């Protein structure tokens, strides 16, 4: 028996998912978090491509775009400042990770380019960062592009900090799930029905974990929202758990920066 | 036995090389199949 | 090394020249020819 | 989304939803004047005339063309050219004022009359913006 | 026109899963519907992504320089 208010109850686990039953909180909060997780958790991905040679069929920017979606590592990240804040005229190992990439069509039979082929050149400073997250079976992950005989492609990528607000590539999110009051004892909806509401509209896996209706009983007008069945997936860069704590955290910090301002704000004046 | 002007030929028609050609031939000719 | 310039549509092979040096390729009469990328490095945004 | 106009998930646009391409093809040849008075493809400038343009000519290699890697924008020249009269009047080809992007591939060929025929392609990636139509 | 790294809708990576799909078909001989279910593509946002892509790239790669 312990802990203040908000309390999880991990329903299941997976290197790529965290079906948990986060209960007893404000829906507002539940979501406010959900959101944070989606677009504001720091990540790391390519954001600058330097095409030296390209004979592909995918014109530069086409590739340059994918390269940015290619999930890159970021276990640490927190120890790699946003190029923008750093002082290095442009970028440096202090703010970014550099990768290489070259392919030639030796196999006169479709030579493939894979995220695995990227090559970290800048000092990794010793810290899990920049490694092309791979969840491939044969360990190739993310087919970048193809080429024929004498097709050549020479690049230079420069991954920086970033968050989903600036662009999706920095989305550690992938897709979260959300649901509550699986029976609708609050009536937050008005089921559209031709005949039987209960028939046409499928029930949910979450009905079980919550007491069914019970016709007799009147209506609860004091009904609120507790217990929310979420399912934070992930793309790699960050472990499905971090995509949740860092969510719980990132948000938290902001919620404090507000105080921080309430303070700095007072000190001032004559 | 004299020669007279030029008849701009319709593509993918009898008098067109493409009429015969296939896959390879085309792709080689750059002409999309 | 040996810097290139133009190229053949089919017999694609670095070429080059200048005014009056013909137009055809040093082989394929195919009088086409591209100008090939710049040594200069292009750059892009990963979005 | 009101009145036949939609809201479009930006997040998904990033991941590339509905991105398209766009190629344009500026072009030009070398005039003639019977008396063998012919034009030319070069990267001109002063040379008496002053009859030039306003876009950065620099992006012009010597053949009077732009390398297939360059990034064009305003009205930078894409084809330097001159006309012989009586001595260096311009006939260059600027960019689509509004448009702008990357040279995708230039090409030089003959032209029956032997004349130098040149077509130039400019690639551009257009992303779905708020005013766009679908 | 090459696989689409990640899903437009939600984002869940999908650039890798390509080769595995085409295989769980010509080889492992399955039916699209499951093939996909096999590679982790649960909800349709991701599903439609693969099931619909047209790998033109091949047809392109079959030209020249
Ligand atoms: Zn720096
Ligand atoms: Zn040739
Ligand atoms: Zn999806």
GROMACS .gro file of C-alpha atoms in nm, chain C residues 12-42:
model
   31
  315UNK     CA    1   2.688   0.726  -7.125
  316UNK     CA    2   3.053   0.812  -7.073
  317UNK     CA    3   3.210   1.136  -6.952
  318UNK     CA    4   3.300   1.348  -7.255
  319UNK     CA    5   3.325   1.729  -7.292
  320UNK     CA    6   3.476   1.962  -7.552
  321UNK     CA    7   3.372   2.305  -7.674
  322UNK     CA    8   3.258   2.517  -7.971
  323UNK     CA    9   3.283   2.352  -8.315
  324UNK     CA   10   3.421   2.031  -8.159
  325UNK     CA   11   3.111   1.870  -8.311
  326UNK     CA   12   2.814   1.760  -8.102
  327UNK     CA   13   2.801   1.382  -8.135
  328UNK     CA   14   2.962   1.151  -7.883
  329UNK     CA   15   3.313   1.004  -7.919
  330UNK     CA   16   3.136   0.692  -8.048
  331UNK     CA   17   2.753   0.686  -8.049
  332UNK     CA   18   2.645   0.929  -8.316
  333UNK     CA   19   2.342   0.987  -8.088
  334UNK     CA   20   2.380   1.365  -8.080
  335UNK     CA   21   2.220   1.406  -7.734
  336UNK     CA   22   2.440   1.462  -7.421
  337UNK     CA   23   2.377   1.571  -7.060
  338UNK     CA   24   2.579   1.811  -6.845
  339UNK     CA   25   2.636   1.602  -6.529
  340UNK     CA   26   2.618   1.725  -6.164
  341UNK     CA   27   2.834   1.995  -6.012
  342UNK     CA   28   3.148   1.921  -5.817
  343UNK     CA   29   2.983   2.174  -5.586
  344UNK     CA   30   2.803   1.995  -5.301
  345UNK     CA   31   2.426   2.038  -5.285
   0.00000   0.00000   0.00000
